[PDB]
Amino acid sequence: CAEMMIKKAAQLILGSDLDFEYTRIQVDLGPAFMFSPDEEKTLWVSGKNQETLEKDLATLNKSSVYFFRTGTQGGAGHWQVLYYEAAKSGWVSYSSQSNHFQVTDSNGKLTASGKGLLVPHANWGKENGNYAFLLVNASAENIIHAANFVYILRTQNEVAAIEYCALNHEFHPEIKRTA
Numbered sequence: 259c260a261e262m263m264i265k266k267a268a269q270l271i272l273g274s275d276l277d278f279e280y281t282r283i284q285v286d287l288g289p290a291f292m293f294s295p296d297e298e299k300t301l302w303v304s305g306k307n308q309e310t311l312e313k314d315l316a317t318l319n320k321s322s323v324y325f326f327r328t329g330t331q332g333g334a335g336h337w338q339v340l341y342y343e344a345a346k347s348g349w350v351s352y353s354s355q356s357n358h359f360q361v362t363d364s365n366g367k368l369t370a371s372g373k374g375l376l377v378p379h380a381n382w383g384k385e386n387g388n389y390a391f392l393l394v395n396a397s398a399e400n401i402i403h404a405a406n407f408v409y410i411l412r413t414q415n416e417v418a419a420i421e422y423c424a425l426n427h428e429f430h431p432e433i434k435r436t437a
Contacts, residue, residue, distance in 0.1 A: 260285040262354040263325075263339045264404045267396045268435070270323045270341055277434040278409055287325065287337040289416070290407035291394045293423050298400065302391040303382045305375060312367050314391075315349055318342075323396035325404065326351060328375065332386040339396060399427065406430050 261278055268276045291299070304310035318324075320342035327335040338353040340361070348369070352358040359371035368375075375391075382389045394400055403423050409430050410419035422430075429435055 259354055260287060260337075260408050261405075263337065263352060264401065264408065266341075266352050267323055267325070267339050267401045267404070270339075271396055271401060272398060272435070274435050274437050276405060276429075277436070278405070279432045279434060280412065282413070285408055285411055286335065287404060287407070288327070288335055289420055290404045290423060291325070291400060292420065293403060294394055294400055298395040298397060300393045301384060302393070303384065303388070305389055305391065306378055306380070306382050308368055308373065308376060311375065312362070315362055316366055318349075320344075325394040325396055325400065327392040327394075329389070331384065331388050331390050335392075340393065341396075402427065402429055405433050409433055 265276045268274050302314045304314045324340040326338050326340035329335040338351045343350045347364040349361040351361055360369050361372035363369055377389055380389050407419045407423050410422045
């Protein structure tokens with residue numbers, strides 16, 4: 259399930275399918291990105307108002323892909339992949355096969371599902387407790403980190419998974435990549 263959005267990222271950026279060869283829970287992806295540089299991370303605080311979020315979305319290039327976290331700073335996060343789908347002329351959020359929805363209309367304003375990203379009557383900001391959006395570039399290395407983190411977390415444990423991510427720059431060999 260965490261694997262589903264990672265597979266999707268891989269399809270869009272690496273032109274490839276990932277097969278997680280599990281020969282023996284659900285995951286918070288956040289820690290997979292601890293070794294990602296700050297230059298690949300952007301925090302938005304624009305979710306009080308419809309207008310500001312639409313002009314945040316307008317600053318993104320439409321051939322780039324992100325791991326997109328909704329929720330509160332320091333809190334529970336919901337991770338999904340954000341990408342621009344040329345066919346449907348809009349930004350799409352993809353969590354899994356079952357859970358995905360379009361975010362923007364043909365000309366860059368929020369769809370009805372997308373307005374679900376707003377919380378008008380809450381505090382938005384950098385600080386602990388606030389709402390924000392975290393975009394992590396879905397670069398090859400971040401896709402690799404996410405795949406490896408989840409794989410080691412399931413087959414071993416979370417300490418092992420952060421330790422692995424500290425040192426490893428390639429897909430774990432049991433994570434099969436084919437074009």
